Design a protein around this nucleic acid. Structure first.
Ligand SMILES: [Mg+2]
Ligand SMILES: [Mg+2]
Ligand SMILES: [Mg+2]
Ligand SMILES: [Mg+2]
Ligand SMILES: [Mg+2]
Ligand SMILES: [Mg+2]
Ligand SMILES: [Mg+2]
Ligand SMILES: [Mg+2]
Ligand SMILES: [Mg+2]
Ligand SMILES: [Mg+2]
Ligand SMILES: [Mg+2]
Ligand SMILES: [Mg+2]
Ligand SMILES: [Mg+2]
Ligand SMILES: [Mg+2]
Ligand SMILES: [Mg+2]
Ligand SMILES: [Mg+2]
Ligand SMILES: [Mg+2]
Ligand SMILES: [Mg+2]
Ligand SMILES: [Mg+2]
Ligand SMILES: [Mg+2]
Ligand SMILES: [Mg+2]
Ligand SMILES: [Mg+2]
Ligand SMILES: [Mg+2]
Ligand SMILES: [Mg+2]
Ligand SMILES: [Mg+2]
Ligand SMILES: [Mg+2]
Ligand SMILES: [Mg+2]
Ligand SMILES: [Mg+2]
Ligand SMILES: [Mg+2]
Ligand SMILES: [Mg+2]
Ligand SMILES: [Mg+2]
Ligand SMILES: [Mg+2]
Ligand SMILES: [Mg+2]
Ligand SMILES: [Mg+2]
Ligand SMILES: [Mg+2]
Ligand SMILES: [Mg+2]
Ligand SMILES: [Mg+2]
Ligand SMILES: [Mg+2]
Ligand SMILES: [Mg+2]
Ligand SMILES: [Mg+2]
Ligand SMILES: [Mg+2]
Ligand SMILES: [Mg+2]
Ligand SMILES: [Mg+2]
Ligand SMILES: [Mg+2]
Ligand SMILES: [Mg+2]
Ligand SMILES: [Mg+2]
Ligand SMILES: [Mg+2]
Ligand SMILES: [Mg+2]
Ligand SMILES: [Mg+2]
Ligand SMILES: [Mg+2]
Ligand SMILES: [Mg+2]
Ligand SMILES: [Mg+2]
Ligand SMILES: [Mg+2]
Ligand SMILES: [Mg+2]
Ligand SMILES: [Mg+2]
Ligand SMILES: [Mg+2]
Ligand SMILES: [Mg+2]
Ligand SMILES: [Mg+2]
Ligand SMILES: [Mg+2]
Ligand SMILES: [Mg+2]
Ligand SMILES: [Mg+2]
Ligand SMILES: [Mg+2]
Ligand SMILES: [Mg+2]
Ligand SMILES: [Mg+2]
Ligand SMILES: [Mg+2]
Ligand SMILES: [Mg+2]
Ligand SMILES: [Mg+2]
Ligand SMILES: [Mg+2]
Ligand SMILES: [Mg+2]
Ligand SMILES: [Mg+2]
Ligand SMILES: [Mg+2]
Ligand SMILES: [Mg+2]
Ligand SMILES: [Mg+2]
Ligand SMILES: [Mg+2]
Ligand SMILES: [Mg+2]
Ligand SMILES: [Mg+2]
Ligand SMILES: [Mg+2]
Ligand SMILES: [Mg+2]
Ligand SMILES: [Mg+2]
Ligand SMILES: [Mg+2]
Ligand SMILES: [Mg+2]
Ligand SMILES: [Mg+2]
Ligand SMILES: [Mg+2]
Ligand SMILES: [Mg+2]
Ligand SMILES: [Mg+2]
Ligand SMILES: [Mg+2]
Ligand SMILES: [Mg+2]
Ligand SMILES: [Mg+2]
Ligand SMILES: [Mg+2]
Ligand SMILES: [Mg+2]
Ligand SMILES: [Mg+2]
Ligand SMILES: [Mg+2]
Ligand SMILES: [Mg+2]
Ligand SMILES: [Mg+2]
Ligand SMILES: [Mg+2]
Ligand SMILES: [Mg+2]
Ligand SMILES: [Mg+2]
Ligand SMILES: [Mg+2]
Ligand SMILES: [Mg+2]
Ligand SMILES: [Mg+2]
Ligand SMILES: [Mg+2]
Ligand SMILES: [Mg+2]
Ligand SMILES: [Mg+2]
Ligand SMILES: [Mg+2]
Ligand SMILES: [Mg+2]
Ligand SMILES: [Mg+2]
Ligand SMILES: [Mg+2]
Ligand SMILES: [Mg+2]
Ligand SMILES: [Mg+2]
Ligand SMILES: [Mg+2]
Ligand SMILES: [Mg+2]
Ligand SMILES: [Mg+2]
Ligand SMILES: [Mg+2]
Ligand SMILES: [Mg+2]
Ligand SMILES: [Mg+2]
Ligand SMILES: [Mg+2]
Ligand SMILES: [Mg+2]
Ligand SMILES: [Mg+2]
Ligand SMILES: [Mg+2]
Ligand SMILES: [Mg+2]
Ligand SMILES: [Mg+2]
Ligand SMILES: [Mg+2]
Ligand SMILES: [Mg+2]
Ligand SMILES: [Mg+2]
Ligand SMILES: [Mg+2]
Ligand SMILES: [Mg+2]
Ligand SMILES: [Mg+2]
Ligand SMILES: [Mg+2]
Ligand SMILES: [Mg+2]
Ligand SMILES: [Mg+2]
Ligand SMILES: [Mg+2]
Ligand SMILES: [Mg+2]
Ligand SMILES: [Mg+2]
Ligand SMILES: [Mg+2]
Ligand SMILES: [Mg+2]
Ligand SMILES: [Mg+2]
Ligand SMILES: [Mg+2]
Ligand SMILES: [Mg+2]
Ligand SMILES: [Mg+2]
Ligand SMILES: [Mg+2]
Ligand SMILES: [Mg+2]
Ligand SMILES: [Mg+2]
Ligand SMILES: [Mg+2]
Ligand SMILES: [Mg+2]
Ligand SMILES: [Mg+2]
Ligand SMILES: [Mg+2]
Ligand SMILES: [Mg+2]
Ligand SMILES: [Mg+2]
Ligand SMILES: [Mg+2]
Ligand SMILES: [Mg+2]
Ligand SMILES: [Mg+2]
Ligand SMILES: [Mg+2]
Ligand SMILES: [Mg+2]
Ligand SMILES: [Mg+2]
Ligand SMILES: [Mg+2]
Ligand SMILES: [Mg+2]
Ligand SMILES: [Mg+2]
Ligand SMILES: [Mg+2]
Ligand SMILES: [Mg+2]
Ligand SMILES: [Mg+2]
Ligand SMILES: [Mg+2]
Ligand SMILES: [Mg+2]
Ligand SMILES: [Mg+2]
Ligand SMILES: [Mg+2]
Ligand SMILES: [Mg+2]
Ligand SMILES: [Mg+2]
Ligand SMILES: [Mg+2]
Ligand SMILES: [Mg+2]
Ligand SMILES: [Mg+2]
Ligand SMILES: [Mg+2]
Ligand SMILES: [Mg+2]
Ligand SMILES: [Mg+2]
Ligand SMILES: [Mg+2]
Ligand SMILES: [Mg+2]
Ligand SMILES: [Mg+2]
Ligand SMILES: [Mg+2]
Ligand SMILES: [Mg+2]
Ligand SMILES: [Mg+2]
Ligand SMILES: [Mg+2]
Ligand SMILES: [Mg+2]
Ligand SMILES: [Mg+2]
Ligand SMILES: [Mg+2]
Ligand SMILES: [Mg+2]
Ligand SMILES: [Mg+2]
Ligand SMILES: [Mg+2]
Ligand SMILES: [Mg+2]
Ligand SMILES: [Mg+2]
Ligand SMILES: [Mg+2]
Ligand SMILES: [Mg+2]
Ligand SMILES: [Mg+2]
Ligand SMILES: [Mg+2]
Ligand SMILES: [Mg+2]
Ligand SMILES: [Mg+2]
Ligand SMILES: [Mg+2]
Ligand SMILES: [Mg+2]
Ligand SMILES: [Mg+2]
Ligand SMILES: [Mg+2]
Ligand SMILES: [Mg+2]
Ligand SMILES: [Mg+2]
Ligand SMILES: [Mg+2]
Ligand SMILES: [Mg+2]
Ligand SMILES: [Mg+2]
Ligand SMILES: [Mg+2]
Ligand SMILES: [Mg+2]
Ligand SMILES: [Mg+2]
Ligand SMILES: [Mg+2]
Ligand SMILES: [Mg+2]
Ligand SMILES: [Mg+2]
Ligand SMILES: [Mg+2]
Ligand SMILES: [Mg+2]
Ligand SMILES: [Mg+2]
Ligand SMILES: [Mg+2]
Ligand SMILES: [Mg+2]
Ligand SMILES: [Mg+2]
Ligand SMILES: [Mg+2]
Ligand SMILES: [Mg+2]
Ligand SMILES: [Mg+2]
Ligand SMILES: [Mg+2]
Ligand SMILES: [Mg+2]
Ligand SMILES: [Mg+2]
Ligand SMILES: [Mg+2]
Ligand SMILES: [Mg+2]
Ligand SMILES: [Mg+2]
Ligand SMILES: [Mg+2]
Ligand SMILES: [Mg+2]
Ligand SMILES: [Mg+2]
Ligand SMILES: [Mg+2]
Ligand SMILES: [Mg+2]
Ligand SMILES: [Mg+2]
Ligand SMILES: [Mg+2]
Ligand SMILES: [Mg+2]
Ligand SMILES: [Mg+2]
Ligand SMILES: [Mg+2]
Ligand SMILES: [Mg+2]
Ligand SMILES: [Mg+2]
Ligand SMILES: [Mg+2]
Ligand SMILES: [Mg+2]
Ligand SMILES: [Mg+2]
Ligand SMILES: [Mg+2]
Ligand SMILES: [Mg+2]
Ligand SMILES: [Mg+2]
Ligand SMILES: [Mg+2]
Ligand SMILES: [Mg+2]
Ligand SMILES: [Mg+2]
Ligand SMILES: [Mg+2]
Ligand SMILES: [Mg+2]
Ligand SMILES: [Mg+2]
Ligand SMILES: [Mg+2]
Ligand SMILES: [Mg+2]
Ligand SMILES: [Mg+2]
Ligand SMILES: [Mg+2]
Ligand SMILES: [Mg+2]
Ligand SMILES: [Mg+2]
Ligand SMILES: [Mg+2]
Ligand SMILES: [Mg+2]
Ligand SMILES: [Mg+2]
Ligand SMILES: [Mg+2]
Ligand SMILES: [Mg+2]
Ligand SMILES: [Mg+2]
Ligand SMILES: [Mg+2]
Ligand SMILES: [Mg+2]
Ligand SMILES: [Mg+2]
Ligand SMILES: [Mg+2]
Ligand SMILES: [Mg+2]
Ligand SMILES: [Mg+2]
Ligand SMILES: [Mg+2]
Ligand SMILES: [Mg+2]
Ligand SMILES: [Mg+2]
Ligand SMILES: [Mg+2]
Ligand SMILES: [Mg+2]
Ligand SMILES: [Mg+2]
Ligand SMILES: [Mg+2]
Ligand SMILES: [Mg+2]
Ligand SMILES: [Mg+2]
Ligand SMILES: [Mg+2]
Ligand SMILES: [Mg+2]
Ligand SMILES: [Mg+2]
Ligand SMILES: [Mg+2]
Lengths: 116, 64, 202, 149
RNA sequence: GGGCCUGACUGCGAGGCCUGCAAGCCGAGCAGGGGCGAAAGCCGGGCCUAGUGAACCGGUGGUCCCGUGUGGAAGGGCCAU
RNA sequence: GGAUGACCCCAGGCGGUAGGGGAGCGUUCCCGAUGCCGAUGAAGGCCGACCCGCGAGGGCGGCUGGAGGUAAGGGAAGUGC
RNA sequence: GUGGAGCCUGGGAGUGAGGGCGCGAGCGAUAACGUCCGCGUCCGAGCGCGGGAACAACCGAGACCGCCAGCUAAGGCCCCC
RNA sequence: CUGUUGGGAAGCAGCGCCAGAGAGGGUGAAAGCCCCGUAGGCGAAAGGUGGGGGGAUAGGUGAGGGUACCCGAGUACCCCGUGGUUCGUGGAGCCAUGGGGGAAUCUGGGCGGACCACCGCCUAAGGCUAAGUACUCCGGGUGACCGAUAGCGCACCAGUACCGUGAGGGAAAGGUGAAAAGAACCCCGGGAGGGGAGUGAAAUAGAGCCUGAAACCGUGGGCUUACAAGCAGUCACGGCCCCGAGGGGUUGUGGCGUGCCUAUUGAAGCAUGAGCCGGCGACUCACGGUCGUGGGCGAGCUUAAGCCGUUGAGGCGGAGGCGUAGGGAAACCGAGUCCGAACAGGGCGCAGCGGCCGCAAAGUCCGCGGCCGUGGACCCGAAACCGGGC
RNA sequence: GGGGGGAACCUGGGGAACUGAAACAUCUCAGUACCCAGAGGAGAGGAAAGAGAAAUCGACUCCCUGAGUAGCGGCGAGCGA
């Protein structure tokens, strides 16, 4: 019996096309260009969810560093003092403290100078 | 269509009971005057062909 | 070995038959596979680039036209051209081993036997070629037609009477075969039928 | 047991290998053929059982041996098949060539020769030949060797 | 350098070297009939590593294996070259 | 562990071209089917931020469509751009 | 020394254009992003990731998936960063 | 038949009936019982057939004994040149015959693979001969055959239009609706077209008509954009708009970021290919082989062609094939055999589990899968070669 | 009475090449494609100057098998009773 393409190919193309909603020109309009665009998009997303982990930590650090220098030390010193004091509050949190909770941040700074 | 027996192999070779392939030693067709008797004598025996070469010849003999 | 109900004027007696204890569903499947393959017509066909109606002229020159190279428009790469590896007339049949068919027959009858669904009968009352006659007899014989029946008998008059019933498949005993036994829920046989089947599985 | 229950045993019906159908299959594009060269081409190579790239072949360098025959062909002569004593075990009373053909031991068109693997059994065995030891074992077990001619 | 000699054997060949194949190489030992030596023993060419060419087709000597109804014959196989 | 591929637990492996192997998805057609779904709406089309699945996919809903479609289990190929 | 170790029989391949680098030579001119061998490596197939401004093969390191957590590697810590 | 929903009942419901007929197609949707059919039956004045039945006719039919009349001529036969056969000059016969030579009539002749003998087979040089066999323009039946890029080149006014001096090449192009009820009449317009009215279950079913995807063009709306550097995305945050501790759309800023495929040592590569979209488009089939695998039987396994049956029913058929023994060029011997003087040495061969029962197995058959051989053998592509024509 | 036509099929008279032989000439392709003549619903063949070893069979045709056997073969590729 014969099995002509039929319905099958239009359906794969709509799938891809639908994922390409938003893209510029033929990239949302042409199955071919959409598919190219999507290969790139999936690799970036993978790469970028990796580096979001880095992007944020760099930020926490810039923030911690600012808050430290108001109390007369640098980030590197503050982190060594935390280590020596045995304090394990992470940088995501150290940062929230530095902004939302200056009194607490100050005390951790104190423990950090004291610990050395 | 059915396979054909290769007649050149049928004429040179025999498949033994266990499926080895056997043929005459080469090298005493001629130029024999200065060959020692050890040589002529030993080239008078059959030998068992190396496996890859035998397996090939066997497929040429589908009906032995 | 198996105990099989027999309907009679004297009433429901029992008959002993040695049919296989073991049913081998793979083998049953193999017999049915053979049966259905061999009834195939094999009449699907297509045309090759050589069998298609166009000419063999090279449509345009090999080089310098700015177009792709082609030969004739019969080539399968052209709409209208031949088909690559389409179906051609075919024989789907093959000789399934005789013993398998035999063992298969026997197992199928055996399978219905083990379910109570095999029923042997001496004769068919008043069925003289009329559907309503077979219908009466059937009701009386426990066949309301809620279960499909493979009726096997050499009595032509009985086959005609029953054939039109949607739930009945009829056969002469020389025709007993496993697809029909396996397709139906209940097996009903003449003793004369049962006799030939015993000779065939011997 | 009904039609919906009829199944082949696992492995009885395997899928074919389909090539040139997409990357996920791991057999796309080159269809497992690798890249270029004669073997990848439609039509492929020369008979790999013989051909060796142009050098004289392994087979053709070996010497021919023996009588190959001449027109008008095979010379008609009586052909003998041996069947051992052990194969005669199953019979009782008499064995003749015809019988042995029926039992599926002796092929048609061959004369019978009895051979010595096994024990002899006191039967009357009728045949075109006997090996030395078959004759001995048979005579000794009280069987009766009869020669046909 | 000399004496006697033809083992510059015939039938085989454990086990190895080398090695894609096919080839190439070394070879104790047993048997037959020998050479030299009093004997132990050595001798299956040459101190050694090059001096060579697979198959096909055909020649010659032998063998007496096949011989197209049978006996021969033609022609072939086999051993040697 | 439990007895058996029921699922739980501990550990380890899991970049990949040529290429080997395994397990699946979907298309057309056959048995299943004198059956079953269907105008209270078939196939097909268009939507969906919902459900299941690693995925190929499969559901479910709304709109369009207006007459077909076809399960569990199997079978066969003009089967996936 | 229990390892995607090894050995044996069999089925299926692909490959038989490599390339950079380090070390050892030859060829070249103690030239070439040169050429030709040897041992090793990496790219090839890791054009995935960090460093080297950018950069297949230099340094760091072998990416099963997820995390707005932690420790390091080479390389860095004046601003770009 | 009735009821019911519905434009329509054949759907659903109630109560029935036929069946040698429940194959199938229609009817406003899904019908055994409405129509056409189907099972089972029936039917030719005329023409054709008539291989079957009957009849006729042609034609056919003895035994010794003697005679030695006849028994297919440029023939056999030999030689030369060739063809046919499996036979390619081979030890080359046989059948045929272009050249030369050239008989006999059974006490004749040809043949059994040079030749000779023996032993057999057969009657050349005249002719005819049903059936069993091949094919498919034609008719019918049937599809695990196509379904309008398919299937014939053509579903349609196609071997047409059109192309070519000619031979010759050779398309595209199907579908309103159940029914034309195919939209009277009015309005704008030269008309085309539209707007009402009307028909219809439905009119974005209105004839440029079923469905009506995609590329492509537009109108309307939300978000956004004129100091900005870009393989067009991705991650983050924030603004606005929408649906209602959430989601969706949009995108300002910040981070990261060298298209796809092909071929390559190596490509974003300034190396190939692709304007975009839809559809067509490439590893198959037969037969053999080899391994693997699912079963059946197992010193055995298996049938082919055919025949009987069936009309989607299977059976019979043992001819034959593979296996049961090997070794040897062979004669030949045989669990051995070959080389050899050898009782030497060597090559190649020979030798289930449990409790008489079961179990497994040689092997073999069928199915399935991988790969191989032969075919065009994964698809597309030459320049060329050959035949017959124009 | 002939003449001319008929899709395939059939006999007879003529009769290639690509290709395969991984070059090519013998060989293959193949007595195929194709031209021609003729027949017919078929055509051909057919009643032994046969076969070929059986003391045998008994016209011809056609299918299965014998058998990829016997053989043929730059003893190659292959061909094949
Ligand atoms: Mg397709
Ligand atoms: Mg299609
Ligand atoms: Mg499609
Ligand atoms: Mg697609
Ligand atoms: Mg779609
Ligand atoms: Mg899809
Ligand atoms: Mg966007
Ligand atoms: Mg766009
Ligand atoms: Mg655009
Ligand atoms: Mg668009
Ligand atoms: Mg994607
Ligand atoms: Mg990631
Ligand atoms: Mg990353
Ligand atoms: Mg400071
Ligand atoms: Mg630290
Ligand atoms: Mg810390
Ligand atoms: Mg040969
Ligand atoms: Mg030799
Ligand atoms: Mg030679
Ligand atoms: Mg010689
Ligand atoms: Mg010679
Ligand atoms: Mg020498
Ligand atoms: Mg010597
Ligand atoms: Mg010798
Ligand atoms: Mg055979
Ligand atoms: Mg054998
Ligand atoms: Mg079919
Ligand atoms: Mg078919
Ligand atoms: Mg076709
Ligand atoms: Mg066709
Ligand atoms: Mg063509
Ligand atoms: Mg053509
Ligand atoms: Mg044509
Ligand atoms: Mg054509
Ligand atoms: Mg044409
Ligand atoms: Mg042509
Ligand atoms: Mg042409
Ligand atoms: Mg042409
Ligand atoms: Mg060009
Ligand atoms: Mg162009
Ligand atoms: Mg073109
Ligand atoms: Mg173009
Ligand atoms: Mg062209
Ligand atoms: Mg073409
Ligand atoms: Mg062409
Ligand atoms: Mg064509
Ligand atoms: Mg076509
Ligand atoms: Mg067509
Ligand atoms: Mg095609
Ligand atoms: Mg093809
Ligand atoms: Mg083709
Ligand atoms: Mg095919
Ligand atoms: Mg057919
Ligand atoms: Mg098949
Ligand atoms: Mg068959
Ligand atoms: Mg019925
Ligand atoms: Mg039924
Ligand atoms: Mg299959
Ligand atoms: Mg794939
Ligand atoms: Mg694979
Ligand atoms: Mg791969
Ligand atoms: Mg590709
Ligand atoms: Mg492969
Ligand atoms: Mg391959
Ligand atoms: Mg390739
Ligand atoms: Mg390659
Ligand atoms: Mg390629
Ligand atoms: Mg290459
Ligand atoms: Mg190449
Ligand atoms: Mg290759
Ligand atoms: Mg390729
Ligand atoms: Mg190619
Ligand atoms: Mg080709
Ligand atoms: Mg080729
Ligand atoms: Mg032979
Ligand atoms: Mg006795
Ligand atoms: Mg002396
Ligand atoms: Mg050795
Ligand atoms: Mg060696
Ligand atoms: Mg001595
Ligand atoms: Mg001695
Ligand atoms: Mg002495
Ligand atoms: Mg010695
Ligand atoms: Mg010297
Ligand atoms: Mg020397
Ligand atoms: Mg030498
Ligand atoms: Mg040669
Ligand atoms: Mg040669
Ligand atoms: Mg010779
Ligand atoms: Mg003779
Ligand atoms: Mg003799
Ligand atoms: Mg003779
Ligand atoms: Mg004599
Ligand atoms: Mg003699
Ligand atoms: Mg003599
Ligand atoms: Mg002689
Ligand atoms: Mg001789
Ligand atoms: Mg010799
Ligand atoms: Mg992996
Ligand atoms: Mg696996
Ligand atoms: Mg697989
Ligand atoms: Mg499924
Ligand atoms: Mg699909
Ligand atoms: Mg599937
Ligand atoms: Mg179908
Ligand atoms: Mg049905
Ligand atoms: Mg249906
Ligand atoms: Mg319903
Ligand atoms: Mg309605
Ligand atoms: Mg609806
Ligand atoms: Mg569907
Ligand atoms: Mg469909
Ligand atoms: Mg979906
Ligand atoms: Mg829908
Ligand atoms: Mg319908
Ligand atoms: Mg279905
Ligand atoms: Mg199904
Ligand atoms: Mg089934
Ligand atoms: Mg296809
Ligand atoms: Mg292990
Ligand atoms: Mg490994
Ligand atoms: Mg490994
Ligand atoms: Mg494979
Ligand atoms: Mg290779
Ligand atoms: Mg390669
Ligand atoms: Mg090379
Ligand atoms: Mg190389
Ligand atoms: Mg290179
Ligand atoms: Mg390398
Ligand atoms: Mg190199
Ligand atoms: Mg570099
Ligand atoms: Mg190097
Ligand atoms: Mg260094
Ligand atoms: Mg160096
Ligand atoms: Mg050097
Ligand atoms: Mg300088
Ligand atoms: Mg270099
Ligand atoms: Mg350098
Ligand atoms: Mg250098
Ligand atoms: Mg290297
Ligand atoms: Mg590469
Ligand atoms: Mg790396
Ligand atoms: Mg690596
Ligand atoms: Mg990469
Ligand atoms: Mg890097
Ligand atoms: Mg970097
Ligand atoms: Mg950097
Ligand atoms: Mg890298
Ligand atoms: Mg890993
Ligand atoms: Mg740290
Ligand atoms: Mg460091
Ligand atoms: Mg820096
Ligand atoms: Mg109403
Ligand atoms: Mg009604
Ligand atoms: Mg009702
Ligand atoms: Mg019926
Ligand atoms: Mg019906
Ligand atoms: Mg109907
Ligand atoms: Mg219904
Ligand atoms: Mg229906
Ligand atoms: Mg109806
Ligand atoms: Mg009738
Ligand atoms: Mg009728
Ligand atoms: Mg008389
Ligand atoms: Mg006379
Ligand atoms: Mg006469
Ligand atoms: Mg005359
Ligand atoms: Mg002549
Ligand atoms: Mg000839
Ligand atoms: Mg010859
Ligand atoms: Mg001849
Ligand atoms: Mg003449
Ligand atoms: Mg005479
Ligand atoms: Mg005479
Ligand atoms: Mg004659
Ligand atoms: Mg003659
Ligand atoms: Mg003669
Ligand atoms: Mg004769
Ligand atoms: Mg004769
Ligand atoms: Mg005639
Ligand atoms: Mg007749
Ligand atoms: Mg006839
Ligand atoms: Mg016919
Ligand atoms: Mg027809
Ligand atoms: Mg279809
Ligand atoms: Mg249809
Ligand atoms: Mg169309
Ligand atoms: Mg068409
Ligand atoms: Mg359409
Ligand atoms: Mg037509
Ligand atoms: Mg067309
Ligand atoms: Mg058309
Ligand atoms: Mg027209
Ligand atoms: Mg012109
Ligand atoms: Mg014109
Ligand atoms: Mg033309
Ligand atoms: Mg066209
Ligand atoms: Mg209509
Ligand atoms: Mg209509
Ligand atoms: Mg309607
Ligand atoms: Mg007006
Ligand atoms: Mg108007
Ligand atoms: Mg208007
Ligand atoms: Mg109007
Ligand atoms: Mg109305
Ligand atoms: Mg309605
Ligand atoms: Mg609409
Ligand atoms: Mg409509
Ligand atoms: Mg339109
Ligand atoms: Mg319609
Ligand atoms: Mg429309
Ligand atoms: Mg439209
Ligand atoms: Mg649109
Ligand atoms: Mg707008
Ligand atoms: Mg500025
Ligand atoms: Mg601005
Ligand atoms: Mg961005
Ligand atoms: Mg941020
Ligand atoms: Mg939002
Ligand atoms: Mg946002
Ligand atoms: Mg990067
Ligand atoms: Mg870029
Ligand atoms: Mg790059
Ligand atoms: Mg791509
Ligand atoms: Mg490309
Ligand atoms: Mg290239
Ligand atoms: Mg290049
Ligand atoms: Mg290059
Ligand atoms: Mg670029
Ligand atoms: Mg560019
Ligand atoms: Mg260029
Ligand atoms: Mg480019
Ligand atoms: Mg290029
Ligand atoms: Mg263009
Ligand atoms: Mg576009
Ligand atoms: Mg497309
Ligand atoms: Mg394949
Ligand atoms: Mg196979
Ligand atoms: Mg098998
Ligand atoms: Mg069986
Ligand atoms: Mg055979
Ligand atoms: Mg021995
Ligand atoms: Mg068993
Ligand atoms: Mg078996
Ligand atoms: Mg293979
Ligand atoms: Mg072909
Ligand atoms: Mg092909
Ligand atoms: Mg192939
Ligand atoms: Mg071509
Ligand atoms: Mg030209
Ligand atoms: Mg030429
Ligand atoms: Mg020429
Ligand atoms: Mg011409
Ligand atoms: Mg001409
Ligand atoms: Mg005429
Ligand atoms: Mg005529
Ligand atoms: Mg002719
Ligand atoms: Mg003539
Ligand atoms: Mg001729
Ligand atoms: Mg000519
Ligand atoms: Mg030629
Ligand atoms: Mg060709
Ligand atoms: Mg070839
Ligand atoms: Mg050639
Ligand atoms: Mg060639
Ligand atoms: Mg040339
Ligand atoms: Mg040639
Ligand atoms: Mg050819
Ligand atoms: Mg020929
Ligand atoms: Mg002719
Ligand atoms: Mg023809
Ligand atoms: Mg005529
Ligand atoms: Mg006829
Ligand atoms: Mg006739
Ligand atoms: Mg005639
Ligand atoms: Mg006569
Ligand atoms: Mg045979
Ligand atoms: Mg020929």
């Amino acid at each position: 019996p014969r099995a002509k393409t039929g319905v099958v190919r239009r359906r794969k193309h709509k799938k891809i096309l639908k994922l390409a909603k938003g893209y510029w020109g033929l990239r949302s309009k042409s199955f071919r260009k959409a598919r190219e665009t999507l290969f790139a998009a999936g690799n970036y997303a993978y790469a970028h969810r990796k580096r979001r982990k880095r992007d944020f930590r760099r930020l926490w650090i810039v923030r911690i560093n600012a808050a430290c220098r108001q109390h007369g030390l640098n980030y590197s010193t503050f982190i060594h003092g935390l280590k020596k004091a045995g304090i394990e509050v992470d940088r995501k949190n150290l940062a929230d403290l530095a902004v939302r909770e200056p009194q607490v941040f100050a005390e951790l700074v104190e423990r950090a100078k004291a610990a050395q | 269509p059915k396979m054909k027996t290769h007649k050149g192999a049928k004429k040179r070779v025999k498949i033994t009971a266990s499926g080895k392939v056997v043929a005459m030693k080469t090298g005493k067709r001629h130029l024999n005057w200065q060959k020692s008797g050890k040589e002529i004598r030993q080239k008078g025996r059959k030998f068992v062909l190396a496996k890859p070469e035998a397996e090939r010849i066997k497929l040429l003999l589908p009906y032995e | 070995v198996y105990q099989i109900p027999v309907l009679s004027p004297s009433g429901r007696r029992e008959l002993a038959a040695d049919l296989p204890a073991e049913i081998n569903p793979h083998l049953l499947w193999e017999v049915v596979r053979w049966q259905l393959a061999k009834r195939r017509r094999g009449t699907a066909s297509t045309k090759t680039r050589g069998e298609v109606a166009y000419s063999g002229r090279k449509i345009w020159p090999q080089k310098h036209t700015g177009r792709a190279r082609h030969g004739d428009i019969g080539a399968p790469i052209f709409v209208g051209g031949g088909v690559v590896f389409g179906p051609k007339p075919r024989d789907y049949s093959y000789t399934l081993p005789k013993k398998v068919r035999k063992k298969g027959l026997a197992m199928a009858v055996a399978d219905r036997a083990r379910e109570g669904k095999l029923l042997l009968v001496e004769a068919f009352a008043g069925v003289n070629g009329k559907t309503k006659e077979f219908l009466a007899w059937a009701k009386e014989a426990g066949l309301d037609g809620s279960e499909s029946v493979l009726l096997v008998t050499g009595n032509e008059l009985v086959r005609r009477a029953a054939r039109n019933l949607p739930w009945v498949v009829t056969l002469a005993p020389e025709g007993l075969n496993v697809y029909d036994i396996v397709r139906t829920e209940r097996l009903v046989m003449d003793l004369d039928a049962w006799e030939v089947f015993q000779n065939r599985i011997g | 047991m009904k039609l919906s229950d009829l199944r082949p045993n696992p492995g009885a019906n395997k899928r074919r290998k389909r090539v040139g159908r997409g990357p996920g299959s791991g057999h796309g594009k080159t269809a497992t053929r690798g890249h270029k060269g004669q073997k990848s081409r439609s039509g492929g190579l020369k008979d790999p059982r013989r051909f060796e790239g142009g050098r004289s072949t392994t087979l053709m360098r070996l010497p021919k041996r023996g009588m190959q025959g001449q027109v008008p062909g095979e010379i008609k002569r009586p052909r003998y098949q041996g069947v051992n004593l052990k194969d005669l075990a199953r019979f009782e009373g008499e064995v003749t060539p015809e019988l042995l053909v029926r039992a599926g031991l002796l092929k048609k068109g061959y004369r019978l020769k009895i051979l010595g693997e096994g024990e002899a059994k006191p039967l009357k065995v009728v045949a075109h030949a006997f090996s030395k030891s078959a004759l001995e074992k048979l005579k000794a077990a009280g069987g009766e060797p009869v020669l046909l001619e």
